Amino acid sequence: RKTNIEAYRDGLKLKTEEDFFACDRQYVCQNYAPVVISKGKGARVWDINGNEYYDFLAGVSSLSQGHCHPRVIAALCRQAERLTLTLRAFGNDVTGPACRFMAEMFGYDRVLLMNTGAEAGESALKIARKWAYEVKEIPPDSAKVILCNNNYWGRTITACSSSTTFDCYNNFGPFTPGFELIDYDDVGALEEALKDPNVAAFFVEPIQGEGGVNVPKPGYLKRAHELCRSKNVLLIVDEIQTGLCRTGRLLAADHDEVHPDILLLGKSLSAGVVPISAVMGRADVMDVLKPGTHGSTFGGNPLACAVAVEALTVLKDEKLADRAERLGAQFRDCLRRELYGKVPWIKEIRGRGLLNAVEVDSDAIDPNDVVMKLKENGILSKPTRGRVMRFIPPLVITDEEHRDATTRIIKSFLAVEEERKK
Amino acid sequence: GARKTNIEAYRDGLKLKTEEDFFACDRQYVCQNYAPVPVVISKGKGARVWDINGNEYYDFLAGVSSLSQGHCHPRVIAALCRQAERLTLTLRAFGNDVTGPACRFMAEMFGYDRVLLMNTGAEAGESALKIARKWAYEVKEIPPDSAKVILCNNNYWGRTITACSSSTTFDCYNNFGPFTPGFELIDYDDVGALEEALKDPNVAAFFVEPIQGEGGVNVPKPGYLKRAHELCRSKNVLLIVDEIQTGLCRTGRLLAADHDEVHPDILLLGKSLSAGVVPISAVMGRADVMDVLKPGTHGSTFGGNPLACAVAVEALTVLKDEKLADRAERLGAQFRDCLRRELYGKVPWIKEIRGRGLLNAVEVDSDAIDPNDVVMKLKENGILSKPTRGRVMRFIPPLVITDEEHRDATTRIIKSFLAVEEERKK
Ligand SMILES: Cc1ncc(COP(=O)(O)O)c(C=O)c1O
Ligand SMILES: Cc1ncc(COP(=O)(O)O)c(C=O)c1O
Ligand SMILES: OC[C@H]1O[C@@H](O)[C@H](O)[C@@H](O)[C@@H]1O
Ligand SMILES: OC[C@H]1O[C@@H](O)[C@H](O)[C@@H](O)[C@@H]1O
Ligand SMILES: OC[C@H]1O[C@H](O)[C@H](O)[C@@H](O)[C@@H]1O
Known about the structure:
- 2 copies of one chain form a homodimer.
- Chain A has 2 domains: 171 residues, Aspartate Aminotransferase, domain 1 (Alpha-Beta Complex); 251 residues, Type I PLP-dependent aspartate aminotransferase-like (Major domain) (Aspartate Aminotransferase, domain 2).
- In chain A, 39% of the residues lie in helices and 17% in strands.
- Chain A is built from 15 helices and 15 strands.
- In chain A, the strands form 3 sheets. A 7-stranded mixed β-sheet of chain A has the order 5-11-10-9-8-6-7, sandwiched between helices. A 4-stranded mixed β-sheet of chain A has the order 1-2-3-14. A 3-stranded antiparallel β-sheet of chain A has the order 12-13-15, with helices on one face.
- In chain A, helix 14 packs across helix 15.
- At the A-B interface, helix 1, helix 2, strand 1, helix 4 and strand 4 of A face helix 1, helix 2, strand 1, helix 4 and strand 4 of B.
- The structure holds pyridoxal-5'-phosphate (2 copies), beta-D-glucopyranose (BGC) (2 copies) and alpha-D-glucopyranose (GLC).
- The site of alpha-D-glucopyranose has 3 residues of chain B, from helix 15.
- The PDB classes it as transferase.
- Keywords: PLP, gabaculine, parasite, Structural Genomics, Center for Structural Genomics of Infectious Diseases, csgid.
């Protein structure tokens, strides 16, 4: 049987990429800015004309397990035929066991399941505030949260209120108060911010994602945790982009040996199949959310839970932390040896595991020529902040595939440089 | 071959046998932000669910109107499995062969120029608020940071900090501040109060439900929405109409706003947009409003993902193919008529039976009866629901409920209320 979307699309006679871009332009809210993908499998996607590419954005680390992982799809399909949604107003035979699975895997007492990263962030801030008011006993409406410049956690009004990125906040106010912004990767600024006794939490990414793959100094996060703990301030660690093996370890916080007070997960939690996010913490923090104080229609639905248990298990069974660590060190090494020196407009090669970036001098080169050239050579990515090229493949990428992609990526940077010399 | 999926292997290894075993698992590992009816549902199909002990029930919450098409509608599940084999996520950073055609499908079905797909109701409300504000600053040219949005007391649109900031429900806001400013709360179903609030020129929008759901199935006087729209239009204020609960045939029309012949300036949809299969929401509006969201000013990882779009197109088509608007109008009018003729005369602690379509409620007097006795008795008679605000009993079945099931269910419901009354007389 043809699905309704397929039958409906056939009647439109969208044959070329430009037909799809025109349909897009006419009917889709125009809040995004080259290719029309119809199929994905593992590390590979295919456009509507049958051309193959490596996906080096991977849902900005939502597709760590690869596109259309057969185990994840089987778990989806099996659960979807049985039960998808009950609400948390009724019990069911999936939510409990799934939260226990997550509790045991990440080492926490309680799991709050929500749907998106932004909801996980809001839920953590809410928990941190109510905890501050109720357990830490700080004055009513006075709770503060410390975040870092160039953070990204969502697009809610409150997320906009805690952004330093002009386009994220501009003309969406007035703003939620209670945020203090400091420099990333700066313990001094954190110590200084931590003198205010009304601070409920410090909310931080172990590597800043959308900010430009800003990898902090080794130990930064341990130091930050020590400072938070000595002031009775919760360390909220956002691993929505950096967790789940992406950096070579189950949590990017494992590098600095930090167990977050509140952990956020998302994205690859579902292998990019359905939106599910998680907030985890110890009992005396998470239990501030009493009945009726927080909710979500779809949060914890049995379909997402079944998908997430399968997705998480893929990470472990395919040993994807080891694969990210190994391949990623080889990637950065090749790019350093074959590009530093030969390509003067490369500012920095940086990353951990398979979360990598090449920042370029956008005064010396058009970054978009790198993007175009990459696509020409079978590599799809999208930079952040104009000038930071991102390289974020599915972790399941094979040794042969990764060698091949690395060659095409290097060849792309070199072809842009040769064209510049003329 | 034969094999377990991991959720099954793991659950099997925990050796959970009784409902108490599952209740205890939930209490230990799941954040305790709900007060659930004590049942452990295992299978859902159409209007029915079964628990782990085998007991069968009619689902009379239906995900609070997330499952209008029934549990596990075979067409929606087939569309889900088919698209999931092919492509589930690209981001809007890349094009794909589904997202644009799905937005076009919706734009044409609802009559709007532009469609924004988000994931949850809360995200749709946040996005609409962002649109109305930026539009106010850039098109209406009101002063920087001065935009106001009018909402109604007892509204419910989400649990973000900004939603908490615009709530009048104590447990939604308490100890979650400090709050997002820029909200002006008025009584629901009060034209005079809306009129006075609209005298402030910094008002960007009026954000309103055609029936308040979580607030208690509060059905306004007829014409209330039409009148709200005329007032908003005369002051160059956007009418944002939240149909996340009331939309998609639930009230006997495609949109509840259709009763008043209102076309919202911004329309919010969600919940049954996916037939309860995956979270997807939508914000729709005319080009000169929606186009304020320029590249880089708003986004979402999973918003408009191809899996969700294929499910939503299938879910929407089910509404039309099974004529669920007509089924809701008919069955709902019979339900309310039956309940009034069988319960009002006999049951003194029912204050009111109200609703539209198959969005119905029975408000009880909780100073006279423990509402939880009604919930328990319903369950014992094969009916699952959860009240809102302590004392508003909700009857919101899947619209696919058959005539025979609906009659059977209505008998069970009437018998439940009369039995609690019989205990009260004693
Ligand atoms: C670190 C981090 N937090 C939060 C989010 C928000 O995710 P969502 O788009 O699922 O709301 C993202 C997505 O880009 C992210 O990378
Ligand atoms: C009218 C209305 N708006 C918004 C929401 C928020 O939906 P979600 O729980 O999917 O965020 C709901 C659902 O509870 C609703 O009924
Ligand atoms: O020129 C018209 C545009 O829209 C489509 O109708 C055509 O197929 C494309 O070639 C073009 O981008
Ligand atoms: O046939 C429907 C589905 O049922 C599940 O039990 C299988 O493992 C899936 O792969 C299959 O697509
Ligand atoms: O549809 C009405 C239903 O009501 C009865 O309780 C029967 O037990 C059930 O099998 C039947 O299908």
